[PDB]
Ligand binder design. Sequence first.
Ligand SMILES: O=C(O)Cc1ccccc1Nc1c(Cl)cccc1Cl
Ligand SMILES: O=C(O)Cc1ccccc1Nc1c(Cl)cccc1Cl
Length: 580
Amino acid sequence: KSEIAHRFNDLGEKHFKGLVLVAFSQYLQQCPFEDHVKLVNEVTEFAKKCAADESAENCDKSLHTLFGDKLCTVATLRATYGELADCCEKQEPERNECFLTHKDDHPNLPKLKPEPDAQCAAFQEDPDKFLGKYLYEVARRHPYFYGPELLFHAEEYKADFTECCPADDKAGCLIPKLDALKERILLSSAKERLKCSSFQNFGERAVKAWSVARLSQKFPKADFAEVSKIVTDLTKVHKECCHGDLLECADDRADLAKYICEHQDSISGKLKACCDKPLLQKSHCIAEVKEDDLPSDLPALAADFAEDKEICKHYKDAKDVFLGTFLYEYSRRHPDYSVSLLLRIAKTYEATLEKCCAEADPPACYATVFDQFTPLVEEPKSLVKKNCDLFEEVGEYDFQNALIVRYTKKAPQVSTPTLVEIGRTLGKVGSRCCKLPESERLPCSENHLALALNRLCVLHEKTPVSEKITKCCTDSLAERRPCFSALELDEGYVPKEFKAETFTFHADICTLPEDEKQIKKQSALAELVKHKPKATKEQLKTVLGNFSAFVAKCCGAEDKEACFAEEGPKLVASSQLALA
Ligand SMILES: O=C(O)Cc1ccccc1Nc1c(Cl)cccc1Cl
Ligand SMILES: O=C(O)Cc1ccccc1Nc1c(Cl)cccc1Cl
């Protein structure tokens, strides 16, 4: 009868309101908080009426119809969102699609800087309004953020203020917590956004393949039936969440967690800790669970995948099940491979069968199929080792610098703030991944790389500037990283005209916290490359060293600006001689 009543009944009022606030903030990213609150309360009032009498008027409409109808009542819709008032002319599902298109991946809203006294005050004042605020602020900023996980993060955010606002050192307790939390949020947003990008750009089959490979590594004791089931269900959850159907998404998510925990003994022994937990923590723990130990009864794969004489008939009869089975088997025994690598191995298996089966004696041809995986494996392994050796030698900041230069050369048309952001993110990947046990570094690195590359691709959809990026971003999901790695200096690139101001620092840099100081220097680095694209990485490092020395000296001077004004312009000119 009434979907809205059904979801209201299933989720309860608290989770329902939270999810509806999230969905509205993601769809209308510029509205003030107070106004979204009103819309939520009205939707929720309706849901309560409907739960009382489902026969009642309009109780029978779709969620998207009801929710889209609300969004369309917003005051100043045409002033604030010029592009969205046309959407309101349309019916479902055409209206939702239109809303989905308008979501803004880089709204560029002010940075959320933890102010512990002003926030503790607001929290003590009204914790409900304060937590609502956190849902709204994050959601607007990350419009494909995994809705139910955001509620989870609100619990953490609430726990942080609960523990820290009474403390002796309130800023000392709190600032490191909110910083860790923000890192976790950024990572989670990027993961989810890759899933939504994958549905958008490559389709559900790609998402399923990704998930089969990843879940098989996580749950290598599970049989293919159980993996298939989980994948099918998990794919439907994320498809709903990526489509804006957050209530349906959350409900289906809760059903999957329930299933997983009832079957935990045949899925993974690491799930025991997760299943002993309240609802949102449970789902979160499942989503993040570590990989189980390999069972001792993993089957040898040659017999079915390389030696069987009827492989060409099985491949032809049920490609999807046969290849899926291959992917499940190979992935469960390879937690030391990245997901994308496993997908490349699966595509190579597929292509080898295609080739061998259109041939005189196929079996003598596909006998050696596993041997074709070797180079796919060895190349990223040596890339990771080389990158991690560099990180360990130079540290995060200089590793970031190296990546900035690398990516600026590959795509000098991209805006400096984007290049800096991706290079900085890539350096953080190094900090995360390079210190792991050595068998974990390839999957950690490549998997996280995929998140950063996807960010760049998402931004480029919004603001296209390079055909080379478009091609890497759209050709093949599993080949994206290798495609980016293979990019070299864009040789058709005309060096950006020199503007001395870009390289000209002033005493204002001296008051910045370290990370913002680095960003300024990294921005100037990216600009050096744009103006001198053939400068070598070693020249660039020297010049950047000369700039950092100059900044540090002038920042410690008696008269900071006189220092910057005297010495700056010499450095700016001589630095150009030191490049290309
Ligand atoms: O960057 C590349 O193209 C090489 C490569 C290949 C596979 C996986 C990772 C990396 N690079 C890499 C690594 Cl291994 C760690 C931190 C940051 C980066 Cl960019
Ligand atoms: O990109 C690399 O291969 C690392 C590399 C090696 C030698 C010299 C410089 C660099 N990278 C690099 C750059 Cl390009 C700028 C500033 C600081 C560093 Cl460590």
